[PDB]
Chain length 159, copies 12
């Protein structure tokens, strides 16, 4: 139960990071996206292909899903049932970060060859290293919040 503390400490850590991430690091997401091309739509299409669901929004949704269960239990006041969700969700949103983007590392260059683009065009990601760090932290916490939630889970099923 001295871990139910750290959960609250880390639950905020990822938030204030997500804020800094969502606003300064990422900022106007697609505006910063650059492609060597005079082709209209080629940039819009190349962005959609490599970012079906951008990071800030995955993390947005993730934190929304790792929060709804915490609300459910407060409404019943099924507590063990909530812990289950907060794990599979928080872990599911890590699988969607490996698949898609591939490996918690931001690209500096993606070579898109979608339709409007006449040939393969060099699209350049803005500010990747800074973004990378904020993946690490966001993913680290996401990974840690799991362990503490599995612990409290077992602590109920063992005892």
């Amino acid at each position: 139960s001295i871990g139910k503390i750290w959960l609250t400490v880390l639950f905020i850590f990822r938030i204030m990071i997500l804020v800094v991430a969502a606003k300064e690091v990422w900022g106007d997401e697609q505006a910063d996206f650059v492609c060597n091309t005079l082709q209209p739509g080629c940039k819009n299409v190349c962005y959609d292909h490599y970012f079906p669901i951008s990071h800030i929004r995955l993390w947005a949704l993730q934190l929304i899903f790792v929060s709804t269960p915490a609300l459910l239990v407060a409404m019943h006041v099924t507590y063990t049932s909530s812990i289950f969700f907060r794990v599979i969700f928080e872990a599911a949103f890590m699988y969607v970060f490996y698949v898609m983007y591939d490996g918690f590392s931001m690209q500096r260059l993606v070579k898109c060859n979608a339709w409007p683009c006449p040939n393969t065009v060099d699209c350049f990601v803005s500010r990747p290293t800074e973004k990378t760090v904020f993946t690490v932290f966001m993913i680290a916490v996401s990974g840690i919040c799991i362990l503490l939630n599995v612990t409290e889970l077992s602590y109920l099923l063992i005892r």
Copy 2:
């Protein structure tokens, strides 16, 4: 009894989703809209033809219409007659998403030949896949809020 728990949770849910949808996903809805043309107005007319009421502003109206009936009650304090509204509205707004936009799926491209345009021209929707995801979540919860209010209806 447990029914009106989820209804407030999912209500709060679809809101935070709607926020992220409006501010980030859609962003400056029309400004991100791109067309292959140099004709002044062709973009504005082809955006009107294909998006007469943007998703965010429908959902905006949706969450408004599905909120008045639950406020009528709070003021009077009829209730069963409000839920009658909370269903048909939330369903009506679901109808205007299949009709218009042609089925909860963002078109990656649309071809408009409205008057200002010299001929038919390519217009490229930005971020269709991500918008598509959020339409699903917004329509799913909408499809869900229907049930809980009908189970509550059939419960009486």
Copy 3:
């Protein structure tokens, strides 16, 4: 007095609509305004001619005038005198919507021939249909808030 409720219910309905209207639907009002011309000022002038007082601001003022009386009475605590204002104002701001703009329907094209413009230029309104809906609702409520206010008025002069 079960109508003094609906007045409060509709008084908010037009607001949250005005917000959605003022921000998303309309947004940067004149920036979205387009005219086929390389003439500086021709756009600024053509906008002033067809929109002496834009909608969001009429509705802004309208709601300010259909609110000042409600404040006056709270300060006296002349109640029937306040109801009178909330009607003529709310109705006056409907006459200024018929005259000017002509018929609660947004134009898709206005052909301006003001001074800076060399000849008549085709100015294109952005996003008219969406705006039109929000006139209907804003005008509907404006029209309904009248009826309920005239009712309460008569209910005092009859009884």
Copy 4:
């Protein structure tokens, strides 16, 4: 007694009006300013010559100066000596609107030939009619707040 009712109402009134005026009507005051030239700085100098203190920033200062005297009293808690200020200020700011801008009416066009400009050039004010309306409302209430404070002055 009934006098200090309207004074707070109209004070709140002119504020909400001032808001809509600053944020929407005027908007990005200078950015909307357009001139028929390709000279860097001609626009900035012709905006300074004709708008040394933008309407919104005068009214901003106005509502500031007409607020300190009514705060002096609250702190001390003189009062009749504050109203003396609340009149002359609100009137002084009325003087700088006839002088400067040349009579509560927005010029649709101004012709500036300041140094950077090669000659005299057309500069087109955006949205003059709407700004004109709001000047009227801001000056009207200002003209009114004068009376209620003079009636209150003559009342004593």
Copy 5:
């Protein structure tokens, strides 16, 4: 002690002015800065030279320094020691306004000849007269807040 009032009255006056100053008068500070040149960096460099520390930020810092002492004393609750700071600071930030900018008067034109610039370029300041007024008021108050603080200082050292 009827002066400790006016201090609070003037401490706010400069603020609400600083707000109007920081937002409307100045606004996007460097964006409004114009230079007759096609030289990249020449504008950025010419701005840095003539504005090492812009006004709004000096006033920002000034008010931060003429506030920290007022917080210190509230934490002890050395009261005379705080008055000392609020003077030297508030006065120091007036010396940095004379030196730099030279004389509480905004330039309408500065002729910069820094490196990237090929030759001397005419850089034009936006909206100087309006800014000038707001210096006067900001500096006036700054100058007045001193007198009242020196008075209260002496009132403690004399009595």
Copy 6:
């Protein structure tokens, strides 16, 4: 005892400073970044090479890391073990400012020849002197918060 007074004051201090720094001084950090080139991406790559973590986002992380230990305590309510963190963090972030940026002084110019760029090119940092001032204030207070927490450490 008097030590934990200044620590909260200077903590509040460096915040308001950090605000003005982020919103005004730095502003739109990268957008103000200018390079002498016409190559798409050369600017974005030369900004990544020389600013892998912008000052504001380091300090953002800094004030975050130097805040968790002081929250661990509030929740448990160890304390002496938190101050151990409050020092090393605030010092570690001081190390990444000498390393990276090359010594608390904003470069007025940087010369990047990353791949997209055809050769080495001039890139001009905007507002280096003012940023330099704020780095000093942010590092000074950081250097100070170290002492008060070590005096508090040596005090025990």
Copy 7:
């Protein structure tokens, strides 16, 4: 027969004028044509409407037709038959200058409202007064060459 001289003197006068006209005065004919519009084709169309057959080419053709007969007779060596042609042609090409262009006077402004053009656009003719003079001379000579040719005609039919 002392007039058959002047015919040769004036036949060259119009030529060297046509050269100066065709090259310097007119020059790149359509390139100099300007229209206040961003509409592609609107300029090309507005030019075709007001200049179905430009001057230099009418004069080119005219001089070709007032020359072919002079060649015919040289080939027979029907002499009176040639004089007839050189008149009707040289006069026909004056009717096509009145009709079309209207009155041997070049416009300074033509207001075209052809299809591609969104509305009526102000198209500006380059260098009209200079062109006008060269019409006068070209038309004067054209008019004089007639008189001398009708004289020689009658001199054969009378005698």
Copy 8:
């Protein structure tokens, strides 16, 4: 005998006409070609599709082919066998003007949707009426030179 008079006259005629046509009327044939697009190559491909052999270069080839047979004779010095060519050539080139260009009349507009173009686009021919006139004169004389050489053929 009188037949071979006009044939040299009209031959010289159609030349001077061809000159004025090439240098002034058509001018820089393709450069004057305008299309409503921003796609690189769409103009070049739509000019190739609709003008595989420009009028001037057909007539150029025409006057070449209708000149060799009259040179064969001068060198040999057969003659009646050359006139056989001087007819069929001058007629064949008349066929490729009805086919291609679709009947001796310059199209004021053509609508091309070749690959590079995103869709069908407006392409505006410059000076169609004047070109039309010269096609008439070039085809008329061509139609005439046929007769004089057939009368000369039937004369034998």
Copy 9:
């Protein structure tokens, strides 16, 4: 007798001068004309107002008019009656250079406010000094050819 020597020499002189003047000095007369404006047509109208007949095209006409009388004679082969023309023409064209252009000196700048222009605007003549030199040489020789033909006139 020696008079008609120089007259042919200086005639050949002013020609070669006129050539260099037209092709190099003046060049593309109007294209080199620059105005401080973004108004379509303001340049074309301000060139018409100030140069109704360009120098080169006057001199072109000049050398034409002063050549016909000397051709009348060659054909007739009256002569003394031609020289009468060769003087008045060459003098008349001298009059239209003082009037118009305002005295054999190229204006470095002209200020035109014809209709299309929003106001008065700077228009900068290119290469005024060099053009000025050639006007002098063209007018000098013109002033000289007058004398030799008047001495020849007074000689008879």
Copy 10:
């Protein structure tokens, strides 16, 4: 020897074609060359790769080489030696047209991926079909001038 005539007839045919080819058909050769790219040099490089020696210049050189021998013999006046050159040259310059350009047919599109170009870029040839015809004729004549030259060659070695 009635073939030595046709040689002179065809020797001119290719010329007047080359003129029409060099001036109107081809014209400003590289200016008409278009590539979908904002890359400086990418067009210059892509042109050099696909056109090491453009057609008009090959034909220019060809005709220079199929002419020098005809001059040599006129200077001696080794006649059979000249015929030999006029063949191998005229035929060599046909091998350089097959190799390079590949098959007497002009491309409408070439996909260049040379250095300055970021990726493969679509370069568009202007006016290919017209050019193609003029290859056929230029190559036809080139091919015919061979046969007549080999005939006259054999006519000397047989007899």
Copy 11:
């Protein structure tokens, strides 16, 4: 009189050089002139100041003046009088090349500060070294043609 030959040999040498000079080396004279400025007229004015009379035209005039006398004598056929002109002229046009341009050496950079220019602007001369050579040759010949003309002059006044 074996020098009257070389005069004719050098009189042509400067010509064919002037041609190469006038066309390729110099070419479109002012078009190649570049100035770092967005100021209209500043380039036109800066060109007029540093090139009151460009080289090709001085040489054009020079050769016209060193030719008129050679024509005069042919018309008389005062021979010694012609030699005098061909010297002072050919030498006068060397003084106007020292004064103006200063020293038979073309600038690579001229810093113009004429009126339209806001401040001093860097104007860049195109292709100076090549031009310089052609001054040397044009001036060399000009200098040599003098010596031979003074010789023939003295040869008449001595003998």
Copy 12:
């Protein structure tokens, strides 16, 4: 005797080659020159540094210098003393092609960092391969004309 045959042939040869080279191959020499920069003058200075005397203008001078000696003779009508010049000139101009341009091979790219340029920049020579071919032909014939005049020299 047969030697002075080829010398006139190859002289005429290298001319027609020089023509095609100047007008078509090189064309507008500098205008086709492209550099990756936005600095006014960087292109003009980097063209001067790497092409102080363009190929065409060297060969222009070459054919001039190798023509005077053969004209000295025609006028005098020494001869053997002219051939002495016709060799050294034609050889000297061969030296300034190895030195300068660095060996009869057109550089496809050159990297210039002259003053106006901010740093070293890519400058792309247009049509290097074709120019290379013509340098070969011009230098080959030049290398040949040397022999025939030395054989003619050694013949005496």
